[PDB]
Amino acid sequence: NLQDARIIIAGGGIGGAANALALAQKGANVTLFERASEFGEVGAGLQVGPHGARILDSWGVLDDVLSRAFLPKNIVFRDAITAEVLTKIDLGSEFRGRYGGPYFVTHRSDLHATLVDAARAAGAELHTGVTVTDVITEGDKAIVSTDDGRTHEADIALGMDGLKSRLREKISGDEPVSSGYAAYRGTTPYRDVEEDIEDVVGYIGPRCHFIQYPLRGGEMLNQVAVFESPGFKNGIENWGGPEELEQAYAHCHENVRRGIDYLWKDRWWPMYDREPIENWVDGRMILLGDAAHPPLEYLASGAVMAIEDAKCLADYAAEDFSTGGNSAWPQILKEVNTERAPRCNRILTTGRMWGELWHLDGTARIARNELFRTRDTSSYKYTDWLWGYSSDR
Amino acid sequence: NLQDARIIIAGGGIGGAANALALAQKGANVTLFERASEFGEVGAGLQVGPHGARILDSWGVLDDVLSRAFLPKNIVFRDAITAEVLTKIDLGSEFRGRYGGPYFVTHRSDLHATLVDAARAAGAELHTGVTVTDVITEGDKAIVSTDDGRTHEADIALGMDGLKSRLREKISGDEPVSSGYAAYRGTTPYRDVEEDIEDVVGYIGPRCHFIQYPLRGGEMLNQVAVFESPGFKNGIENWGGPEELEQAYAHCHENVRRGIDYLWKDRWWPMYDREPIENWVDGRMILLGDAAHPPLEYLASGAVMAIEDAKCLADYAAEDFSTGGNSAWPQILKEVNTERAPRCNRILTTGRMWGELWHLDGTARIARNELFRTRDTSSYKYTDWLWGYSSDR
Ligand SMILES: Cc1cc2nc3c(=O)[nH]c(=O)nc-3n(C[C@H](O)[C@H](O)[C@H](O)COP(=O)(O)OP(=O)(O)OC[C@H]3O[C@@H](n4cnc5c(N)ncnc54)[C@H](O)[C@@H]3O)c2cc1C
Ligand SMILES: Cc1cc2nc3c(=O)[nH]c(=O)nc-3n(C[C@H](O)[C@H](O)[C@H](O)COP(=O)(O)OP(=O)(O)OC[C@H]3O[C@@H](n4cnc5c(N)ncnc54)[C@H](O)[C@@H]3O)c2cc1C
Prior knowledge:
Oligomer: homodimer
Protein name (chains A, B): Probable salicylate monooxygenase
Keywords (chains A, B): FAD, Flavoprotein, Monooxygenase, Nucleotide-binding, Oxidoreductase
Order of helices and strands of chain A: EHEEHHEEHEHEEEEEEEEEHHHEEEHHHH
Enzyme class (chains A, B): oxidoreductase
Organism (chains A, B): Rhodococcus jostii (strain RHA1)
Shape of chain A: globular
Cofactor (chains A, B): FAD
Bound molecules: flavin-adenine dinucleotide
């Protein structure tokens, strides 16, 4: 275990909170700096497959999380134009048996608050309203600077400052790559939404998709609309605005079009990712979460990847640190990097392809529809790589 | 039977020859006018599925045709970039059992000469070097004008003057619609072509395909390359020239690229079709063959459709004419039109989609490839509509 280790975490999102919890459960001294003045996430849904569920259970927080979550029966793909079901992924007991946990959906804010509170309970020292302005390595320590003039010493630091990470600049000059798709969200009271839904339902169509699922044991309905923005292709800086919505879904089924009216219009998420990179480490600093591997939303695994990052790091560290102390941190970081890069980078890359597959038109959509419909649903070859992965060695 | 009937056929291609044979076998008086000074087709291959094979057998000419033909074992689809097999259609005995004939390939010129000779043997009067310049209906007869100043009387006339039919102008002002794909052909001695091929092999790729099959009992190899012409999209009148070939296949596998060198470069077929039409009849004139339903090459059924046209017409006429004589011709023509239009027009329309499916790129090609690979090969749902059709009533 990590009793003698000091780790500093720049960033307090799902990633940084998950890592605080994982490490402090191992007895490490953890200090986390979050820029925002309170901890919080959007009060909208996210999806957490069994690859994340499992890990939350090993942390002892899954039951509590499930008590405020929803357990869908299936993932259902529908054609966005005809509303016709193309296929289902069964989330029943064979699925739970094989992957070792439920696929569930919950409020981001609830999941985030659960991890913060459990990190706090495990002994992690968390600080809001504090921006990390620099990390360098000197001798065998990470030196972290904060925007109040202080510097802090630790054995390693974790750069978990998200998609627009400034700590990533130590390792790479790349910029975010726009997919040209904008994402809108909504949460409505179930009853108020205009039949019944017990699943994650994804309507896929040319240049768009529309996702729905219940939350809080059937009481809320989350809705997400993602569409290709004409404005991005014409050079607009603040592209994807709400005026584009109606024209974006005009070709789609009524079920999809009714859905548009429940969305929040005062805020949206233009969708970026980054080209995959191999190396995430700089001396005694490692990038994790969106800072190292920000994906497009299609595999619903960005936050799950950060959760995996946390487990892997804590597991690899607790194994190696017991015997070689502070001196072993760089080898540990490297080994975490080697395990995590291939896995996460395939998600980045396959996520782009999967997304493109949702958005086909013309003859390509006919082929796509028929491919989904005629598949062997007992086979797990499209999904084992994603849901069946573990970092255990 | 049709002993008392006089039919005039404008056009002497596979269509018009097939119709001469069908009708003269029923005892009709047949006169055919062909514009070219000799009968002949290109000395290159075509494909004749069981939907045409069957009919040739009922005419008594299939055995003779088969003695100069090739019988492939399969239709094999390969990815034009990787050369990887995507799927096969088995042409074995289950296939022959179900559809009632072989799928075969032969020289167009051989098939054409066989039908001409058998039409001649059945009593059809054939005339080369004679252009039909007009057909009108008067009272209960078709009056046909020829480019030597003569007019000719018959009970009906068949307009089988091909893709660029001028008789079609009596019924419709439409023009040929360019697909923007150009087709090149080649026939090489089998041995001289650079492993072994016993099938129809179709390499499908972005913006192109390349088809191969043996002829004359394994002695020749037919090769066909079809590619999207950059020149068509830029407004060139005589588009699809041979200079475009190399760039068109540069992205493809070596097997495909070696293939390009065997093609005839001094002649090519830019590919046109026409929007489907319902009505083919004008008084006592019916359009048949390419004049009524010219397809793109993808289902390999243009000439087969003309062969079906012949059978249907002769069968429907011999049934109805025995009892109501010359007076029944318009009702006969209408009934042939009603049987044949839905069938042929679905071929026109599905042929476009099938073609587009061959030419996908990007993620769409990945979906397409996987769709071909994972299909139930024992199922016949993609093919019954095409190969299992009969006009028998
Ligand atoms: C529309 C949409 C839907 C999604 N759905 C899903 C889903 O269903 N399932 C799923 O698993 N994933 C999903 N994701 C991905 C997921 O939201 C992210 O991958 C995940 O939140 C990344 O977490 P993170 O902690 O690495 O980074 P972030 O969550 O971006 O948090 C980084 C934190 O660091 C703070 N920060 C920044 N700079 C500094 C600094 N210098 N010092 C201190 N703090 C700093 C920020 O304030 C922020 O709180 C989705 C993403 C989007 C856009
Ligand atoms: C590259 C390519 C590959 C193909 N492969 C296949 C295949 O594999 N299988 C298949 O089944 N089909 C195939 N086809 C389709 C097939 O070639 C045609 O559909 C078929 O030949 C049409 O026959 P037709 O007799 O109706 O018309 P045409 O064959 O065009 O013949 C019409 C005839 O009428 C004559 N004519 C024109 N005007 C007059 C007039 N005023 N008076 C007298 N005569 C006139 C012309 O000289 C011509 O001989 C292919 C086509 C192409 C372009």
